[PDB]
């Protein structure tokens, strides 16, 4: 979630340009961002973010059942740019945007906006209403080309803030060996007993409900080998753009 990033990372963009969601949302899926080529001072413009995915997809939910995907994004503007207040947004723009509640990444960070989780069904495309600053009013702003960066996600992540895996990821063998037993649990999930003859050790690998098993009793496996297919149907992607803060004189 955006909140996880907000809580654990001071800045959502790393020195390499990687956006922090990628630390937990491990698969890569496209994202696109559209903005005008140029914008005049103190005027509102739209930053249109696309986080596309096959709407027929159903993902494994926390409970082990399959369900719909939700989407979310973090938009990083230059200092001085902000979310447009309601009094500056046209009623048309208003309805184009929809019922979205944009938030500042942190109260002191007005140039970084987050949104989500919200249903992918409705928000595969999200319009951020942005208010351009004014070089005439702000000394740290100028008539320049400015970069804009976005990170957009669809689907449950693979790792929690505490570093533990979620059920939306692949489960790998914790020991190489031969599978001596596979216990199918009543409400789903399994217990896989592995005998690592080489190290003379027995280990039991637990599989969460909702994943598809790839192994059978009597099968030999290696350490780290996948015991399940990767259930993840979602993904995180990044995009960038450049906008000219145009001199009204030109």
Q: Which residues of 60-97 are buried (b: 16+ CB within 10 A; e: fewer)?
A: beeeeeeeebbbbbbbbbbebbbbbeeeebeeeeeeeb
Which residues, at least 6 apart from 170, have a Cβ–Cβ distance to it below 8 Å?
226, 228, 229, 230, 231, 232
- 197-236 residues near ligand HEM, rule: CB under 6 A: none
Query: Is 21 among the annotated ligand-binding positions?
Result: yes
- 53-82 residues near ligand HEM, rule: CB under 6 A: 62, 69-74
Q: Is the separation of the CB atoms in 115 and 72 below 8 Å?
A: yes
CB of 50 to ligand HEM, least distance (A): 14
Query: Is 142 among the annotated ligand-binding positions?
Result: no
Q: Is the separation of the CB atoms in 78 and 13 below 8 Å?
A: no
CB of 115 to ligand HEM, least distance (A): 8
Size of the site for ligand HEM (CB under 6 A): 28
CB of 197 to ligand HEM, least distance (A): 36
Which residues, at least 6 apart from 90, have a Cβ–Cβ distance to it below 8 Å?
none
CB of 157 to ligand HEM, least distance (A): 3
Identify the sign of the CA torsion 241, 17, 104, 125: positive
For ligand HEM, the closer of residues 71 and 182 by Cβ is 71
Report CA Rg, the chain.
23
CA distance 178 to 171: 16
Identify the sign of the CA torsion 131, 137, 143, 146: negative
For ligand HEM, the closer of residues 80 and 157 by Cβ is 157
Q: Which member of 2, 80, 177, 237 binds ligand HEM (CB under 6 A)?
A: 2
Contact letters for ligand HEM, residues 4-33 (x by CB under 6 A): xx------x-------xx-xxx--------
Could you list the residues known to form a binding site, using ranges: 1, 21, 24-25
Residues forming the site for ligand HEM (CB under 6 A) = 1-2, 4-5, 12, 20-21, 23-25, 62, 69-74, 116-117, 151, 153, 155-157, 159-161, 166
């Amino acid at each position: 979630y955006p909140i996880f990033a907000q809580q654990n990372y001071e800045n959502p963009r790393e020195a390499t340009g990687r956006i922090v969601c990628a630390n937990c949302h491990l698969a890569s899926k496209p994202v696109d961002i559209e903005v005008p080529q140029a914008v005049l001072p103190d005027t509102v413009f739209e930053a249109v973010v696309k986080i596309p995915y096959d709407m027929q997809l159903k993902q494994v939910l926390a409970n082990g059942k399959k369900g719909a995907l939700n989407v979310g994004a973090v938009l990083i503007l230059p200092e001085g740019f902000e979310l447009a207040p309601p009094d500056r947004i046209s009623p048309e723009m208003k309805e184009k945007i929809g019922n979205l509640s944009f938030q500042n990444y942190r109260p002191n960070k007005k140039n970084i906006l987050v949104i989500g989780p919200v249903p992918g069904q409705k928000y595969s495309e999200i319009t951020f209403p942005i208010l351009a600053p004014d070089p005439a009013t702000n000394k740290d702003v100028h008539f320049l080309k400015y970069p804009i960066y976005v990170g957009g996600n669809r689907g449950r992540g693979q790792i929690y803030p505490d570093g533990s895996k979620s059920n939306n990821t692949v489960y790998n063998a914790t020991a190489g060996g031969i599978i001596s037993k596979i216990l199918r649990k009543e409400k789903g999930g399994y217990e896989i007993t592995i005998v690592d003859a080489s190290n003379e050790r027995q280990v039991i690998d637990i599989i969460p409900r909702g994943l598809e098993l790839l192994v059978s009793e009597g099968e030999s496996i290696k350490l780290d080998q996948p015991l399940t297919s990767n259930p993840n149907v979602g993904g995180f992607g990044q995009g960038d753009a450049e906008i000219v803060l145009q001199d009204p004189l030109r």
